Amino acid sequence: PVEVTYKNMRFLITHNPTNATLNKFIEELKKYGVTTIVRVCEATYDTTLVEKEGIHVLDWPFDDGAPPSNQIVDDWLSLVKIKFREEPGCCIAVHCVAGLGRAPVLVALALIEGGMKYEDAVQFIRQKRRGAFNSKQLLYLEKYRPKMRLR
Amino acid sequence: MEELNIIQGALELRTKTVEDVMTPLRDCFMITGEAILDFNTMSEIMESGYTRIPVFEGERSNIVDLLFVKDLAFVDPDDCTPLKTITKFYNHPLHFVFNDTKLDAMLEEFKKGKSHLAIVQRVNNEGEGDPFYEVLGIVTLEDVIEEIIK
Ligand SMILES: Nc1ncnc2c1ncn2[C@@H]1O[C@H](COP(=O)(O)OP(=O)(O)OP(=O)(O)O)[C@@H](O)[C@H]1O
Ligand SMILES: [Zn+2]
Numbered sequence A: 001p002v003e004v005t006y007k008n009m010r011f012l013i014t015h016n017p018t019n020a021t022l023n024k025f026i027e028e029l030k031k032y033g034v035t036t037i038v039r040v041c042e043a044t045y046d047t048t049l050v051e052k053e054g055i056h057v058l059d060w061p062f063d064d065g066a067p068p069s070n071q072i073v074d075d076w077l078s079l080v081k082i083k084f085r086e087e088p089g090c091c092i093a094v095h096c097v098a099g100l101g102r103a104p105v106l107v108a109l110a111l112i113e114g115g116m117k118y119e120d121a122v123q124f125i126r127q128k129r130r131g132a133f134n135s136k137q138l139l140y141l142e143k144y145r146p147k148m149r150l151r
Numbered sequence B: 001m002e003e004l005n006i007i008q009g010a011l012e013l014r015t016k017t018v019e020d021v022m023t024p025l026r027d028c029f030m031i032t033g034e035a036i037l038d039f040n041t042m043s044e045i046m047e048s049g050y051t052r053i054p055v056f057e058g059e060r061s062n063i064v065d066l067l068f069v070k071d072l073a074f075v076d077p078d079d080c081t082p083l084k085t086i087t088k089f090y091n092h093p094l095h096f097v098f099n100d101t102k103l104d105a106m107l108e109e110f111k112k113g114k115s116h117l118a119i120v121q122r123v124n125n126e127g128e129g130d131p132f133y134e135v136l137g138i139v140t141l142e143d144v145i146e147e148i149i150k
Helices: A020-030 A046-052 A070-088 A103-112 A118-128 A133-142 B001-011 B041-046 B083-090 B104-109 B139-149
Strands: A002-006 A009-014 A036-041 A056-059 A089-094 B052-056 B063-068 B096-098 B118-122 B131-141
Touching: A002 A118, A009 A020, A009 A103, A020 A036, A020 A046, A020 A089, A020 A133, A020 B131, A036 A070, A036 B139, A046 A056, A070 A089, A070 A103, A070 B041, A089 B104, A103 A118, A118 A133, B001 B139, B041 B063, B131 B139
Parallel strands: A009 A089, A036 A056, A036 A089, B096 B118
Antiparallel strands: A002 A009, B052 B063, B118 B131
């Protein structure tokens, strides 16, 4: 459960919960002030209870250890810009069953899209969690062309 | 003599890592969280002679808690009390240290902080899958002490 703050946008990368831990899970997620959850790996649990608590869940899976497709990236940036305007000061949660690969990448894209340099961003990410990137993903973020879509 | 072994051991605390002194996972004595504390289970724990016993859930590479023997004190064997219960009572801190960690640092991290035990884990960077943490086993104070009195 790692918090990342920059400008007006705030993200939270968490471990993937079990079905029983939801009782203790919501309690955590309500504390950080989450609204939306982005599931990038596989569906491990019933989303029903979660959305019942007022927390919307989004499943945008993609290949393990591989960069996210353009579709996912655009939807992601749109989701960020819209959700942070809709309720300023809230948080978007990303998680996966594996960890450190796919989830922090989306966060990194949004981070460099928010006016942070590639190096400075990856350093800020890895400082909070060691490792956190594989061979393929490092390259994707290195050469990523920022659209400055946030503004 | 013995002094000279201590001195050498102490200078080589910078060089050496926790991965060098650690106890491999395969040789670790552990216990399932689903364990029930009855006469047999409690007796077996006590028979091992380990003060600190790792508690894993599912696969052994997954360590969810730590059980000291002093936690078994007023627990009754005839009561058949689940282990989850006891761990809920005391809830001892569980530290995770990386394999590339120097012994100097590990020693200091043992001095400040209560715990004499730590879990060894490493970053798995093999392609192309997502990098994950891999639990190799445990390292205790007596380990880093042993390196430095040879
Ligand atoms: N539960 C255990 N299962 C397997 N190996 C252990 C266990 N506890 C400690 N070890 C290993 O045994 C060696 C001695 O450890 P240690 O002396 O800390 O054990 P202990 O008797 O349980 O505790 P203490 O140091 O407080 O007497 C070390 O290599 C340590 O890594
Ligand atoms: Zn001992």
